[PDB]
Ligand binder design. Structure first.
Ligand SMILES: Nc1ccn([C@@H]2O[C@H](COP(=O)(O)OP(=O)(O)OC[C@H]3Oc4nc5nc(N)nc(O)c5nc4C(S)=C3S)[C@@H](O)[C@H]2O)c(=O)n1
Ligand code: FES
Ligand code: FES
Length: 906
């Protein structure tokens, strides 16, 4: 060891470090400059970017031995604080460039360094800078980030003033539909926002640090676990196994469908007799530090008997395959889909035009910049309190309580920390029971943190769909029948697997009036990573095949792909694939708005193709519902305060999409008659001991269901304040009358669950999108590049423009990674952020445009619908169609990697 004096943010600092310490750990653990985040931990995400002696570097790959004496270091805390904000922070906030905000510090530091060298960079300049510096963002779609940089540049040049680009309160007083920054913006652009890992530095002394001892084989029987050596290791307080669990040591699927072959009780908290997938946690180590715990976990020995490994749906379907879950077939669920008349006479008729095909959607990894993390402790009332990224706190409490041997809500409390994105993986419990297990055994606060390799090998994935479907149309182009078949590879754990399978009966071919449908669905258990909901939850996987086949049918009929769609879309008379009348009929109108953009891309693409680079254009229609199937309910309370302000209590979980902006905009709008201003609406959210059951932030339901519960609770407060015949009471007069201050609100969606053949009215609101893309294909290699994206959308009235804009940009970006680069197949190649193929800035076109068709929803709060999962419904189908359109190559098996595009090239 040696002391090194280094100047941090203008001040000298003598630090007692070890030459092998990583600059990132030093800055975090010793200087508590928590704004410097550790994402991938391998220098790919740039989330740990700091400026070291004028050079922009990634602090996670810098040894202390390589850092000079008196070296100057600049972190976000050296750029601006909440009281003395930098123009770069102001632009970020005014553009809504910070969603989950986990990559914000790295992007801002990196940007500030760019401006020191170039006061007037072009958008392209900025894009290259982030590209060269590995600044990754999984939320924004990048566009907002560049928009923010360009504005801060004009301000530093003295061309625009801060007050000039900032949101100003209208004479209206209304913030519903405005571009008002989100409540959490400031905390996020300053690096004060505390994420799970950051909290580890601020916990009490006696806090313990966990490490998991994971299985490295995919399938096996457990003959024994030897904790002996790990116990003897330095710093280890205790080592737990399945023997230390008090409850059933199982996680229930809760809502497991009645006709499922299994019972939803197969997931162990800590495996006891079998290993179902690579990553499986067989023991928990408790140490005085993370480094000490991780090091002792490797020293835990397993006595196993290797069983065959079924790494795909087909394999687990082979007739000789053994049951992964003894006493339950690997195909534990069958889904029927029957609408209209029998479809066989339509396919057997030589006079119809038939198009058939087999497609495949991959096991897409969520790739959040922040790996999983959470902590827990014993309450001052004897309750186990667990903090995590859970986006369904009430649901997860119920899913884990029995296996821990606890009772909700008397022994257990769940709290959602500030989340650095989930994109769905948190609809599933990840480490909530593990932390709870540890907390109960020791009685002390425990903090569990996953490295990026665990975020990859031990969190759910999008489940791959194998689809074989076909259309039967007449010579004029009208689709008369459709037959579909799909198989969902769900890994070993069934939570929500059957529900996902039903999603196929609802969405394959959605958006078109197809009178007769016959299909068969299937949920199959495999030994690959289990399935956790992924933004789209059934839409991206169902609509990819139907939208690609649609273009294949168009070619067989000799009709334009865009015009063909325009011909079959919903119209008065048509119903969905569940037999439900669509809540709005704006499709014809959406096609009309899209048409001008389509025909221009048609000319522009032909007029720009090179002999070495062919360019093409592709379209696709995506549809998804807002809300969970059936009578989906939400709760919320509003309480009047003495100073006349209001405190809103809800459980609108935030993945970083902007649940805060949504609660505020909805409350404010509903509280109009009382004149409440935005700064007078306090928010108490996501804590089962304080906030009501609002339901999960999944299914793109929050804005509609929860929005309505918030709306309702406000209307009750308004009525509670009514002075007999004359106006309103005051917080003062209210107290005197002994009148209640808090008002509870609830709302139930007017929908009905689907029956055994997939029919019914499962969602009250839908989200519709028309995608158009211009892709360039390098004929020589097969490397495709999305050059432009236009998206016409109908999501009802907008609650917050910055939020919805940022949601569409972000959604379209993941759409590109889904089509061109992402996957979780090879356990070693796909265990790192870059390996799995997360899109870097240059992969996303700077040229993205959005057109909104604000048709209002009868059942939405103020006529609004969801937006969450809409931008990921069919943008991948569009990219794929574009590629065929460019070079004639047709890829039905995602992702369309270069060599894959090459193979398919006629
Ligand atoms: N007409 C509308 C509709 C929605 N919104 C806003 O848009 C956001 C998304 O609303 P909604 O579609 O109702 O979805 P939820 O709040 O239920 O969020 C869940 C959704 O959010 C998504 N967006 C994400 N965005 C980010 N940055 N990170 C994630 O992990 C995200 N996870 C995905 C996934 S997956 C899901 S299911 C909310 O801030 C809402 O207030 C709006 O301003 N106006
Ligand atoms: S680049 Fe350092 S944590 Fe990712
Ligand atoms: S805002 Fe960039 S990763 Fe979430």
């Amino acid at each position: 060891m040696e002391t090194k004096t280094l100047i941090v943010n203008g001040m000298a600092r003598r630090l007692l470090v070890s030459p092998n310490d990583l600059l990132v750990d030093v800055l975090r653990s010793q200087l508590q400059l928590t704004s410097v985040k550790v994402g991938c931990g391998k220098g790919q995400c740039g989330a740990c970017t700091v400026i070291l002696d004028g050079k922009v570097v990634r602090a996670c790959i810098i040894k202390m031995s390589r850092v000079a004496e008196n070296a100057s270091v600049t972190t976000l805390e050296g750029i601006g604080a909440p009281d003395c904000l930098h123009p770069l922070q102001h632009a970020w906030i005014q553009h809504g460039a910070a969603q989950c905000g986990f990559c914000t510090p790295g992007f801002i530091v990196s940007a500030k360094a760019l401006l020191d060298e170039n006061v007037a960079p072009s958008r392209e300049d900025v894009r290259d800078w982030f590209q060269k510096h590995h600044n990754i963002c999984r939320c924004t779609g990048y566009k907002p980030l560049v928009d923010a940089v360009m504005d801060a540049a004009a301000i530093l040049r003295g061309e625009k003033t801060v007050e000039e680009i900032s949101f100003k309160m209208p004479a209206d007083g209304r913030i519903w539909g405005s571009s008002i920054p989100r409540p959490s913006a400031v905390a996020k652009v300053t690096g004060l926002a505390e994420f799970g890992a950051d909290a580890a530095l601020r916990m009490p002394e006696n806090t313990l640090h966990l490490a998991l001892a994971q299985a490295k084989v995919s399938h096996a029987l457990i003959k024994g676990i030897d904790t002996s050596e790990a116990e003897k290791m330095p710093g280890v307080y205790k080592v737990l196994t399945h023997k230390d669990v008090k409850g059933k040591n199982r996680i229930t699927g809760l809502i497991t469908f009645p006709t499922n072959k299994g019972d939803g009780w197969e997931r162990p908290i800590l495996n006891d007799s079998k290993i179902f997938q690579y990553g499986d946690a067989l023991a928990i180590v408790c140490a005085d530090s993370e480094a000490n715990a991780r090091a002792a976990a490797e020293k835990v020995k397993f006595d196993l008997e290797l069983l065959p490994e079924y790494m795909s749906a087909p394999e687990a379907m082979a007739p000789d395959a053994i049951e992964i879950h003894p006493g339950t077939p690997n195909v534990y669920y069958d889904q029927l889909e029957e609408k209209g008349e029998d479809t066989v006479p339509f396919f057997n008729d030589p006079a119809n035009v038939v198009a058939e095909g087999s497609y495949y959607t991959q096991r897409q990894p969520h790739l959040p910049i922040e790996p999983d993390v959470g902590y827990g402790y014993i309450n001052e009332q004897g309750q186990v309190v667990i903090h995590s990224k859970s986006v369904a706190i009430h649901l997860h409490a119920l899913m884990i309580a029995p296996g821990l041997g606890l009772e909700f809500p008397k022994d257990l409390v769940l709290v959602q920390n500030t989340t650095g994105g989930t994109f769905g993986y948190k609809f599933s419990p990840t480490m909530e029971a593990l932390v709870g297990v540890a907390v109960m055994a020791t009685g002390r606060p425990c903090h569990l943190r996953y490295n990026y390799e665990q975020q990859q090998n031990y969190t759910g994935k999008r489940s791959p769909f194998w689809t074989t479907m076909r259309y039967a149309a007449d010579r004029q182009g009208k689709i008369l029948a459709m037959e579909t078949d799909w198989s969902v590879d769900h890994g070993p754990y069934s939570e929500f697997g059957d529900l996902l399978t039903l999603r196929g009966a609802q969405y394959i071919g959605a958006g078109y009036g197809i009178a007769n449908i016959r299909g068969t669905g299937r949920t199959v258990a495999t030994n690959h990573c289990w399935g956790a909901a992924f933004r789209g939850y059934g839409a991206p996987e169902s609509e990819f095949p139907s939208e690609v086949l649609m273009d294949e049918l168009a070619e067989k009929l000799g009709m334009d792909p865009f015009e063909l769609r325009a011909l079959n879309c919903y119209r008065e008379g048509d119903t969905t694939s569940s037999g439900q009348i669509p809540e709005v009929m704006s499709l014809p109108e959406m096609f009309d708005k899209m048409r001008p953009y389509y025909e221009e891309s048609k000319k522009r693409v032909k007029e720009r193709s090179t002999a070495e680079i062919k360019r093409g254009v592709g379209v696709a229609l995506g549809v998804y519902g807002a809300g969970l199937d059936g009578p989906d309910t939400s709760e919320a309370w509003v309480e009047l305060n003495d100073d006349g302000s209001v405190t809103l209590g809800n459980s609108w979980e935030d993945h970083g999409q902007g649940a805060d902006a949504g609660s505020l905009g909805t409350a404010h709008e509903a509280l109009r008659p009382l004149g409440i201003t935005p700064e007078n609406i306090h928010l108490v959210m996501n804590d089962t001991s304080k906030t009501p059951n609002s339901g999960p932030a999944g299914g793109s339901r929050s804005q509609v269901v929860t929005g309505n519960a918030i709306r309702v609770a406000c209307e009750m407060l308004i009525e509670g304040m009514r002075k007999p015949g004359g106006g309103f009471f005051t917080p003062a007069e209210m107290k005197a009358e002994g009148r209640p201050m808090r008002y509870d609100g609830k709302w139930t969606a007017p929908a009905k669950d689907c029956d055994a053949k997939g029919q019914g009215s499962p969602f009250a609101c839908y989200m519709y999108g028309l995608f158009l893309t211009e892709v360039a294909v390098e004929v020589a290699t097969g490397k495709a590049t999305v050059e432009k994206m236009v998206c016409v959308a109908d999501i009802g009235k907008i609650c917050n423009k910055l939020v919805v804009d940022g949601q569409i940009y972000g959604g379209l970006a993941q759409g590109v990674g889904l089509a061109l680069s992402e996957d979780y197949e090879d356990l070693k190649k796909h265990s790192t952020m870059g390996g799995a193929g997360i899109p870097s800035i240059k992969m996303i076109p700077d040229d993205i445009e959005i057109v909104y068709v604000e048709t209002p929803r009868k059942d939405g709060p103020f006529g609004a619908s969801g937006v969450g999962e809409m931008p990921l419904t069919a943008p991948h189908a569009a990219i794929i169609n574009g590629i065929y359109n460019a070079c004639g190559a047709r890829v039905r098996h995602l992702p369309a990697r270069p060599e894959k595009v090459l193979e398919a090239m006629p």
